């Protein structure tokens, strides 16, 4: 039943909506059964497989694999039952001092009550599925890593208990999770038996016997032991052929029924699954601030934007899917498909008496071959899974619930198949709704094809001329995509180019292009979004003119301009005439210039720039022997060019970095009452926090990691508790503040645009910077983008941000050394003498901070008479608070107030001038 074909065949809108409603009410059961969990389903499937194998005698297939899984479960269940009974018996002891204190007291009391809740059969199924799914992970050739093994089983069990809670101790300790996982994995290793054949060199004949399925071993990587579980070759070869669906169903897939709209920080997305509004991994501060913001209810605009992003219906492009299926079934590696690789081949072993350099070279070659083979298999398996999902959802309507990371950017909930995937995945997706092309539909389709081929810098008229010139081979490629000229493979995005060529041929065949119905998305991508945001923030006319922010007859290109600057610099260096200059004269690549120039204003280092240029110079192979030194030369030159060119982006970056440093080197006045015990140099628990224009709070999670060994049954894994608040990473926060701010601004603009498009009645899909709508709606889409950009950036964002910092961090203290010879220090020394007189010894900054907090409370105290008394008290921070020149004081260690640097001057540039800048976003 091809629902998409039926919907397109229906000629009347009334019956079209009636059919859509009927499909929606019909697909509820399918969506529920797809979203359902896997534990009971797998248990019943294994039971039925075992019973039918018993009826039929035996098998030697994945059916026998499931029978073996059932046998493992049946043998495991007594062990888990006995363990739970032992835990219950040991928990009923009235009183004891050392009753198996080495083993029972330290562990059974640790993980008794947690284990006694969940059904033993359910835990058995969960651990079996988790260990079977975890295959070839953690860098292990044939097994997986113990550190992930114990956590994954523990985390899955806790998540299972949470599923029992919604059917009716919020979060479990990491140590408890690891202990439970290790215990269950130990029981599974003890039980799992698999038969295997072998030949004894003495006997020189086949031997029949059984061996354990799992083994716990240790591997050495550069002198560090690894906890590794090894999976038997029989299990490896018997699980290899089942992919990721036959053994067990997946969990995250695109839905069919309307996604549940975002209402709270947990209500949205999948119908029967809770998804956090923020991609918070291990950030208690992030989750707390998100919960507070959701309670305050100031992210309704974010909710509207996410609803609009996740309401657009999709379907699988049948023609491109058929072409991809034909190419994949042909078996030879295509441009994107890696192709079918049969098996591993290893070089012959050199003689044991050969040179150690020769042996090292052979070892390196073997390692390289193994890594390449593993990567290629994984890529082929991922492509096969993508094709399987596309075929399963072919002919139906698709919905893509979206989610946000802490920066605010939008990501789909389903990671396997989405519109953010590679070229094949992007080409295999089209909008469910079809809209007439109108007068500008043909023009916009031609523009989309031309800029898909890579000619996006050229004007729209030239793009249309290019498409008109190449319409002949567009039609050719459409008629015979395979076994023909293959013009689409010459493009930058071959699959989307193929889809657009199909659409253009369908338009050309029709007599009247005006009334055609199209489903192909049209990508309208902005140019240099980060530089655009700097231009809007600083109000620099030069930057705005460079980044196509102002209207123009032709679109200027900062990347092209700086590439020409590098050309001039290297032709000046031609006087020196080194080998690097001679090689790189006519081969300076706009791709490396793109990456370096774009990432310079985000705080890239010299090493990072060298690595980026070397990586992007690798595919073209200007220096096949070694490109690193020439890359360093090029980085020096391009850095000189960017430093001479950009002058306001750098100012904004420097102000943000200095602010981040001052925030990361501060501490709360009254909160520091806890005995940190360091005395003079406390710990820092301050993270840069600010709110987006949309209202979403942002908390940078860069904190130190407290990794400690925790004792488990299998081994002492080396994990870190995510609940332990740790001192911040000052360098990480300082280096990451500007990019986080800029991407947050980009996400806010995108969300405002999506909300306004949803209000206007359009279909909107956003791959971060680039925006996708129908070909007919491109003009209104551009108008609404410009309107929303004006609305967002008409306010002084940097000034509001500094005001937010000042409001949030008013009562903060920053420790700064002060010169002993300073006259103001004499008063400070006298005051600390009183702070030493009461203490009776050397004055402590902790006591000084407590005294400072005493005055601040009295200022806000209800008693007016005590407030005057509170204003009478004088401290080191109180004495300096009358002085505004912070740099004047900057020996002795003195507390200083936290004052952020003043914002750079705001250049005069009207932002409304972009209402007619047709080339602003293209």
């Amino acid at each position: 039943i091809n629902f998409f074909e039926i919907y397109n065949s229906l000629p009347t809108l009334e019956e079209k909506k009636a059919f859509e409603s009927a499909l929606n009410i019909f697909n509820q059961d399918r969506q529920k059964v797809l979203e359902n969990r896997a534990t009971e389903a797998a248990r019943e499937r294994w039971k039925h497989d075992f019973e039918e194998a018993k009826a039929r005698g035996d098998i030697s297939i994945e059916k026998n694999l499931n029978v073996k899984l059932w046998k493992w479960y049946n043998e495991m269940l007594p062990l888990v039952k006995e363990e739970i009974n032992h835990c219950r018996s040991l928990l009923s002891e009235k009183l004891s001092d050392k009753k198996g204190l080495n083993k029972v007291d330290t562990n059974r009391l640790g993980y008794g009550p947690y284990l006694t809740l969940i059904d033993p059969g359910k835990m058995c199924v969960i651990t079996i599925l988790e260990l079977l799914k975890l295959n070839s992970t953690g860098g292990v050739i044939e097994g997986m890593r113990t550190a992930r093994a114990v956590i994954s089983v523990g985390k899955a069990i806790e998540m299972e208990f949470r599923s029992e809670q919604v059917l009716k101790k919020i979060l479990w300790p990491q140590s408890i999770r690891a202990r439970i996982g290790s215990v269950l994995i130990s029981m599974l290793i003890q039980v799992a038996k698999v038969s295997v054949q072998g030949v004894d060199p003495v006997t020189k004949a086949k031997v029949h016997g059984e061996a354990p399925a799992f083994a716990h071993g240790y591997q050495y990587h550069n002198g560090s032991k690894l906890g590794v579980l090894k999976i038997h070759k029989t299990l490896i070869r018997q699980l290899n052929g089942e992919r990721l669906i036959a053994s067990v169903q997946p969990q995250l897939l695109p839905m069919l029924v309307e996604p549940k709209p975002w209402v709270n920080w947990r209500s949205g997305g999948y119908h029967y699954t809770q998804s956090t509004l923020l991609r918070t991994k291990d950030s208690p501060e992030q989750v707390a601030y998100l919960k507070a913001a959701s309670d305050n209810g100031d992210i309704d605009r974010v909710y509207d934007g996410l609803n609009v992003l996740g309401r657009t219906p999709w379907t699988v492009n049948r023609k491109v899917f058929d072409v991809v299926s034909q190419v994949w079934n042909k078996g030879e590696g295509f441009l994107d498909i890696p192709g079918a690789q049969d098996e591993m081949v290893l070089p012959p072993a050199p003689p044991k008496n050969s040179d150690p350099s020769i042996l090292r070279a052979w070892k390196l070659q073997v390692k390289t071959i193994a890594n390449k083979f593993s990567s290629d298999r994984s890529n082929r398996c991922d492509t096969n899974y993508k094709l399987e999902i596309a075929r399963a959802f072919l002919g139906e309507k698709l919905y893509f619930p979206h989610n946000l990371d802490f920066r605010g950017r939008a990501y789909p909930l389903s990671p396997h198949f989405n519109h953010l995937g590679n070229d094949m995945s992007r080409g295999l997706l089209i909008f469910w709704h079809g809209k007439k092309l109108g007068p500008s539909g043909l023009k916009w389709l031609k523009i989309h094809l031309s800029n898909l081929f890579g000619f996006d810098k050229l004007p729209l008229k030239d793009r249309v001329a290019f498409t008109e010139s190449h319409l002949q081979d567009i039609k050719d490629s459409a008629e015979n995509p395979l076994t023909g000229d293959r013009w689409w493979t010459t493009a930058d995005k071959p699959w989307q180019a193929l889809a657009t060529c199909f659409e253009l041929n369908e338009v050309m065949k029709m007599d009247n292009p005006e009334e055609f119905i199209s489903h192909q998305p049209v990508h309208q991508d902005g140019t240099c979004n980060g530089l655009q945001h700097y231009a809007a923030l600083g109000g620099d006319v030069e930057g705005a003119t460079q980044v196509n922010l102002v209207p123009s007859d032709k679109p200027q290109d900062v990347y092209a301009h700086v590439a020409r600057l590098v050309q001039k610099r290297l032709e000046i260096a031609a006087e020196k005439g080194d080998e690097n200059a001679k090689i790189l004269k006519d081969k300076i690549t706009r791709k490396v210039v793109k990456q370096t120039v774009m990432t310079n204003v985000y705080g890239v280092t010299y090493v990072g720039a060298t690595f980026q240029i070397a990586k992007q110079l690798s595919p073209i192979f200007d220096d096949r022997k070694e490109s690193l030194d020439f890359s360093k030369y090029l980085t020096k030159h391009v850095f000189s060019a960017i430093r001479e060119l950009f002058h306001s982006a750098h100012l904004i970056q420097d102000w943000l970095g200095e602010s981040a440093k001052r925030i990361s080197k501060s501490i709360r006045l009254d909160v520091d009452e806890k005995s940190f015990k360091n005395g003079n140099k406390p710990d820092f628990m301050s993270s840069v926090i600010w709110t987006t224009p949309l209202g979403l709070p942002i908390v940078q999670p860069y904190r130190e990691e407290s990794k400690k060994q925790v004792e488990t049954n299998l081994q002492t894994v080396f994990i870190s508790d995510p609940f332990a608040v740790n001192p911040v990473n000052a360098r990480r926060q300082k280096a990451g503040l500007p990019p986080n701010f800029i991407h947050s601004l980009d996400a806010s603009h995108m969300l405002l645009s999506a909300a306004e498009c949803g209000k206007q009645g359009l279909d909107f899909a956003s791959v971060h910077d680039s925006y996708w709508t129908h070909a007919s709606d491109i003009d209104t889409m551009n108008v609404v983008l410009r309107e929303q950009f004006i609305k967002l950036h008409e306010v002084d964002l940097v000034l509001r941000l500094k005001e937010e910092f000042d409001q949030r961090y008013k009562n903060y203290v920053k420790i700064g050394k002060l010169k002993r010879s300073t006259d103001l220090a004499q008063k400070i020394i006298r005051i600390r003498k009183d702070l030493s007189r009461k203490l009776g010894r050397s004055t402590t900054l902790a006591d000084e901070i407590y005294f400072e907090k005493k005055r601040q409370e009295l200022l806000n105290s209800p008693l007016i008479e005590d407030r005057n008394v509170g204003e009478k008290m004088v401290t080191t921070v109180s004495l300096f608070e009358d002085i505004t020149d912070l740099d004047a004081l900057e020996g002795m260690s003195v507390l200083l107030p936290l004052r952020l640097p003043e914002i750079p001057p705001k250049g005069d540039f009207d932002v409304t001038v972009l209402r007619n800048s047709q080339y602003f976003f293209s």
Binding site: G139, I141, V196, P201, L226, K352, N353, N371, K372
Partner: protein, 336 residues
Amino acid sequence: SVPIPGIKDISKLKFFYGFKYLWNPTVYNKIFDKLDLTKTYKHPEELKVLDLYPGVGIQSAIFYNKYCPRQYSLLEKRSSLYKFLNAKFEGSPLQILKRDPYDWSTYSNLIDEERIFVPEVQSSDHINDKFLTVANVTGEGSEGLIMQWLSCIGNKNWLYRFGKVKMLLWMPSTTARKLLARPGMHSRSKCSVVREAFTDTKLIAISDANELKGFDSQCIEEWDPILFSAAEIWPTKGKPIALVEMDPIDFDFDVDNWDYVTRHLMILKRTPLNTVMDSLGHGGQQYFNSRITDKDLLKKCPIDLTNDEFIYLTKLFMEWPFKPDILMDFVDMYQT
């Protein structure tokens, strides 16, 4: 007729890269008198000897002044030490070559390319009496060089294809405690295991009396080391320096399998052998429990075992029908 540098000359050397050198001619002549290299090398006049990382080179100068070999070359790449050696030892029968000993290609080029230093290949029946190697790896960060040299002794590739070549090795006292670890000691490691499997070593000198507590008392009293103070090395802040004598011995086993067995067994050096076999592979516990008849061996810990029982376990692993493929025991975290 060979000059010997003094501490006045040595104080002019700014950089030693962490390498500590002894400068006392009294200590060198005492060490040589204890060693008595003349009995093994019947004719020093025809002796060929190669030195690695000479640095100061007073040891080489005294060795030449005592025995006078036909050819004696020094391998260096350190700029300051090489310049000092060239300035001091120019116009002398000694020879100095500017090649870094760390690089494996250095020896192959030096011997098999332009005939500069050609040794004579001898059978493994007895210690070679025509080749001798002296090194100095007192640098703390170059333990891997010594371990690779031990592996090369095992594999008969780097310089031991010429036969059983005696080796003199200035090398740190902590590594001395590591290598000279009898079974049962708390410093027993795979370094000591390969040391006793491939070679038989004697300790000659040590710069600190306190370090002698760690070593085995019987070995110390049998060796009778030449103890000396810590004022005979110019860098005082460095760790104590010991000396060892390396003599290769004959062995009959498969190096790769023995290496795998030792590495994967004595990770858990304190656990009893009744359970450590599970780390070897799948079913190793049951297979070894069934095969092994000596119950005391199972009770013995891997830190109490020696090369004999290690070879026995390697043989058991060899005739294990279901032994895993030891070739692919690595992690694929590799740059691509």
